[PDB]
Structure 1
């Protein structure tokens, strides 16, 4: 698997489509998210692709290596920590991330896992609260989708 897609939906107006593509040793994540409050929103891969209880059943961030919550460029970060997406005034967040830790195959494969867009910005583990080292204080999960294999 070299391509993947996620359709984000929640109990509200947030909705979006993320495309993943394996390019070399990185995964290029693109797509757009809408219905967002302008600003930064925590954007993470949660461990389970279980949507039976909304985004709630997606579990914690995907952290196969048992590291602490960080931002994408940190070394001490969860595999799922893709930091933040930014909604403009109109509520539109354009996603364009290149990540070397997430994968479409193997052990860090995120296929079958959940992409979650959060209510608040990810504090990147630099919040000076324990909550920050676990989730980045991104709060509630607005929309989420299971990452599936794409053509």
Structure 2
């Protein structure tokens, strides 16, 4: 697929539609998430597209290369590290990311995996603690969805 889509849903007020498009050796991510508290929220691709137990069953951050948690710009990051999405006072976050590590095909494709938007911001592996270089301290999983093939 050169195109993918993900519908984020959770137990609370957070929902959103995320679009993915392959361009060169990058994936352009677009869309929006509504119902968010003003400010930043971690935005990551988790390993499994398993929603049997809410967003918890999605597992760890997609990390096929076995590296530590970082920000999208860092060389030392998990493939699923897409940084933070920023919500305005109205609680809407317009997503716009161009990532060079995630892919929509091949060994480490993200199709069939889970997109997760977190409760708190992602400190990009710079919080100092140990929960910083594993998840970036983004908190619980507000909404999530399995990444699917799009027309």
TM-score (normalised: structure 2) = 0.99
Q: Partners in 2 of 1:107 and 1:134 — Cα distance?
A: 22
Q: Which residue number corresponds to residue 13 of structure 1?
A: 13
- 1:97-151: per-residue Cα shift (whole Å, max 9, x none)? 0000000000220000000000000000000000000000000000000000000
TM-superposed deviation, 1:48: 0.1
Q: Partners in 2 of 1:91 and 1:66 — Cα distance?
A: 34
Say which SS state the counterpart of residue 132 (structure 2) adopts: helix
TM-superposed deviation, 1:84: 0.2
Q: Which residue number corresponds to residue 119 of structure 1?
A: 119
Say which SS state the counterpart of residue 7 (structure 1) adopts: strand
TM-superposed deviation, 1:33: 0.2
CA contact (8 A) 1:10 1:54 kept: yes
Q: Partners in 1 of 2:74 and 2:130 — Cα distance?
A: 18
CA contact (8 A) 1:101 1:108 kept: no
TM-superposed deviation, 1:38: 0.5
- 1:36-59: per-residue Cα shift (whole Å, max 9, x none)? 000000000000000000000000
Q: Partners in 1 of 2:122 and 2:94 — Cα distance?
A: 16
Say which SS state the counterpart of residue 57 (structure 1) adopts: helix
Number of residue pairs aligned between Structure 1 and Structure 2: 151
CA-atom RMSD in angstroms: 0.3
Q: Partners in 1 of 2:76 and 2:29 — Cα distance?
A: 21
Q: Partners in 2 of 1:94 and 1:69 — Cα distance?
A: 24
Q: Partners in 1 of 2:124 and 2:24 — Cα distance?
A: 26
Say which SS state the counterpart of residue 117 (structure 2) adopts: strand
